[PDB]
Symmetry: D3
Subunit: 262 residues, 6 copies
């Protein structure tokens, strides 16, 4: 049967829950996960890239801040088509990786965070602030954030709150240079997230001024899961990362094996 | 909503209107425009290449000859879908570029010609089976658009029953390929893209200037001799080599400067 | 008109019928064929690779063993759409290539076998979850086509109910994958492609020769022993490694010669 | 006149003194600095790589921890030969880069640009010889030190190798010790030694480099109370890095492609 | 016996004497000459690049203007060591290449032009104007010119002319943004050239103003081989090219075979 | 202290003593050994390449035929300088690699042969001027070391006055190149490396087997027929193509596995 042309961009929010796990997590990512991934999808993924997270900002834990990276794929077909489940060579993926990322607890005793994998169209749906910004305008602190309203919250209500209450604070903040948003494609993989936003600042101080201090003006919604914006349960209903404009890890173009420092 | 699979090849005819602008324009192209472009379309353009123009031949001005290059994209989706208007980072584009290319005067300019085509030539009119072993080609790519008021079917018939036979009859001409421009994509005023190969510039001139003198001047002619169309407005062209080193998705490594 | 999005993987079984032809065939493949091919399909083939065959195993001749390589393409559109027949530059193709590969005798031919598949295996029949860390594979890729007049459903039933269970039972076999050939694309006489992994040639022989002796000879058999099909006409194969250096769209840098 | 074949590895310790500068510094490094650099030295530098620093560990400030990266060059000739001063195209280098790296204080003390030349091969292998990549991920702590003015270099060397290295050797958390003398003849670098000291992770680093080092006596020349006893960023610099970098610039750079 | 470490940069001035030869010449260079060359010297040449010439400027013929390109190598050893004469595979080199480049004259296809292959140190020896210029300062029209004084002229006399009379005009011209020079290594291959200069302008009009109009003030030297500057026999005693800052033909890095346009 | 500029080409002759070891050995070479090696010497090795051997020809066993590959390095400094013994990361090297290559039994062990040479052949003894346009070569690279007690000058004279003339006389032999091994580097037992080109395996056999029967057996002979030297201990060889896809500093992109 036919395969549907379904061009999409996806984002995975990859945390590292202790600095002691960072070397092992990073090794697995770059030594094992890259080649396993390229091996599988080279023919129908046009871009596969990692954007390391900037250092977690103050109060970033409240925004489900991914301490390792954003992982980005651009697909030509849906990875969730059941026909794609069959692979000659499966990826090497031990449960330790889930520990390092905080999806499971480290050691048996006798609180895990979900794997958030959000599919989007390849083009942002809403260009809300900063249209026409070029790279010549300077370095961006790009805060990418995904949010999913809690169970029982009417999605249209949440949408209206986001666009009529939250975004206007971003608009008013001269520190914020760009606001972009897309609806998550929920029909692909059942992701609990509803929106992905990207909100740019000059720097971490700008991010804090706007996302912590200016947001104190919002009323706390009745559905709030924490006392302050984003009012959503960290890592479950909100995830985020701040990233640079450029990554060296444009993996289909730039990977040459796991060469080690002398 | 869905995005339509629309594989296409497009050509842009990039002029340079003064030799004094060449270094500036070339810098912008290779230093600024390449990375902005790749950044935007890497996920849905499978090839992005520049073919620098050979030196403008004698009378080339009358064919809307692009003195810089042909820019070539191979798209998997239509770049003119309105959803594709949104971009996180927009291209760095000094208005001087439009002066360099002749779109606006320094103080009528020539239009920006961006023609979409199917990926495969629609008509193979001379030289089927030619291989690269057959030798180096002087490849003359030309796009034409009939003036307002000219019936497109009339124009087509003229092109294929009067112009193409002169190409076919010339031993100097080794290949003739043609496609209709996909007018539905972006409103391009061109109607056809032809590619016409010669051994060399002398061959090009022999056929495109001397042999074409036998044509009758059409009633809609905008200039006295073939192509009978307003240079840069209703005809644009470039002569290029078989190979370019600027296969930009594969070969670009940053703007490295000479020592 | 539109072009259909048709993601496919194809395999070509490339033999070398005499060791004396190896240097010449290998030169054409790597010096001439690669650049001609990339030139034609770069915009719509996302992967183009050669997997050189391991040395022919004992009795491998009975399996139509390709003594040069498997050639693998990943297509976004069907290469057999008649619009794709037109090419600016055709491939340089000496008729001797056909002699080297055995399609024509040098002064009975074997057919050129070019099988199109979906990009993902349709059937995972042994070894699901095997990773590269589990060790090196001897990957025996085999394509079969039942003879004229054999009901395709009865061949399929034999394959999956008689042959595959022997593979499933053998500890020497670590993986069994299978897909139906897309016969609508190019009229390929093959019906299935299977890939069957072993640790090594000895394992392959134990299973594909010794264990298969237990099969009853089908009424339609074209040879006495499994695969019961005419070598190179109704069965072709190769054993290959997990990795190839010849991932051509990514890795090719011209025909650089040893010093 | 002839040019001397002088194969060397150099290290530059690149700080980032405020998180607010990180985007600008990183952009300049990757967008501006890489192509300028490759333009100049492609014909006589065989490797040019950046190793981004892991997050600064607790007390890392006392070690002159480079919060951006280590910059690594492998040279075939000396960059300090006076003939190499002439270049067709000079680097684009705005003053602000010096603020972002902390060489100039923002409008309390500036820190020096530390650029240490070494032989390409480590001179001393003091622990963990034979370790392979199969043995696991390393937290590689690279540290350069330079004894204060007035301290006899041989006395400093004796202290380093007779007092400090034994503590590293005693710790099972330390898996590797390597050292080379700095080639001070090349560019007058104040540093005297570069060591690389491997751990499994930041907690192992801390246990050894902070807790175990408490056993050392404070030298009479100490510039701070605890090990390394040297003035941060002036007489000691360091970074913890991974085994692998994607920024192997002569092989891997394809221009400054921006996220969509 | 030992091989001497001899880092050098060399330049070859490649002409195309008729436009009708351009497709053939360009094809041989990129389809045949690149792979033959890389095959031979990959282990001891660290950079191999072509800089295509800008369009020949008015009166450029008088400067021995190379209408195809400059070919540039960076060597670690001297290519003229006799031990390097032996090669497993020799280059494919039709005599027609010599016709296309002008080494064999049209007269039977009066005088051919020599193959000029100048070895230099890797670093310019003299920085005569524009020290400190960066790429941010703007696009350069880089006029690279080599000169060799006629037989009979004392090299010190020629050097004195060059510095007393020519260099001051270059330095004084506001249109000239950079002047660099090196002495040709005369001990490598017998090259008849004595100097390589590179002289930058904004554009061809600036090149003309200085190299044609400002040079009209010069007295004709007793040894002149033509009536106006450079006073040297085009293509025999002077060769040149105007080139851009950047080339896509950085062959050791960027070459992927002779891929043809569709 | 200074490091000496010492440009050299080295060759390692890599055997695979059983076909059952081929997948394992090949995997270690390409998955493990490439990255460890590039990691160590990227800054001072300008080329690192593998030339897979053509199928072992008849009687190739008597020439110490390397059934896996030639491994070729171009060095800027001597790898045997004692300062180069120190490495941050040592190569991952399972003892089984010694078994696969035949240095130890799972038969007498065979030594690791690592011959250093100048980067340029010292002697050009037939075929000077041959280009790649002349056609595909079957390149037989052979290294020999005279047995203990044989005067090296005597061996040299026999090589160049008795053996090489037979190669030169044969129309089947198109090229003969030789260099003396740099024995001061690593104490290699080999004395000479020769490369001897043919059109194909049949030509190789005609010359190296049949034509060589005319030689008198030397008094120091270790086997009855040419090469008269102990296979794998005093002679090693491989036949290889002009081109390899395994030009490892340029072409390696990690161990990507077939789908
Ligand atoms: Cl919930
Ligand atoms: Cl509110
Ligand atoms: Cl709370
Ligand atoms: Cl009109
Ligand atoms: Cl007419
Ligand atoms: Cl049949
Ligand atoms: Cl049927
Ligand atoms: Cl049965
Ligand atoms: Cl039979
Ligand atoms: Cl001090
Ligand atoms: Cl102490
Ligand atoms: Cl001409
Ligand atoms: Cl003269
Ligand atoms: Cl004068
Ligand atoms: Cl004159
Ligand atoms: Cl012996
Ligand atoms: Cl004899
Ligand atoms: Cl014997």
């Amino acid at each position: 049967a036919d395969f549907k042309f379904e061009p999409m961009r996806s984002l995975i929010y990859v945390d590292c829950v202790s600095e002691d796990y960072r070397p092992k997590l990073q090794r697995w990512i770059y030594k094992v996960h890259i080649p396993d991934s390229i091996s599988q999808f080279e023919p129908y993924v046009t871009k596969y890239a990692f954007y390391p997270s900037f250092p977690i900002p103050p109060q970033g834990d409240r925004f489900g801040y991914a301490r390792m990276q954003l992982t980005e794929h651009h697909w030509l077909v849906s990875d969730l088509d059941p026909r794609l489940e069959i692979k000659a060579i499966a990826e090497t993926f031990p449960m330790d990786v889930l520990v390092w990322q905080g999806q499971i607890p480290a050691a048996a005793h006798t609180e895990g965070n979900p794997f958030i994998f959000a599919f989007l169209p390849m083009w942002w749906e809403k260009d809300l602030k900063g249209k026409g910004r070029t790279i010549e305008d300077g370095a961006n602190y790009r805060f990418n954030m995904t949010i999913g309203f809690p169970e029982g919250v009417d999605k249209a209500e949440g949408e209206k709150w986001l666009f009529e209450k939250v975004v206007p604070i971003l608009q008013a903040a001269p520190e914020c240079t760009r606001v972009l948003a897309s609806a998550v494609k929920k029909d692909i993989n059942g992701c609990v997230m509803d929106w992905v936003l990207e909100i740019w600042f000059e720097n971490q101080s700008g991010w804090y001024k706007v996302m912590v201090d200016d947001m104190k003006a919002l009323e706390k919604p009745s559905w709030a899961q924490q006392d302050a914006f984003p009012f959503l349960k960290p890592y479950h209903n909100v995830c985020s990362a701040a990233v640079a404009d450029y990554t060296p890890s444009n993996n289909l173009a730039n990977y040459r094996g796991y060469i080690t420092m002398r």
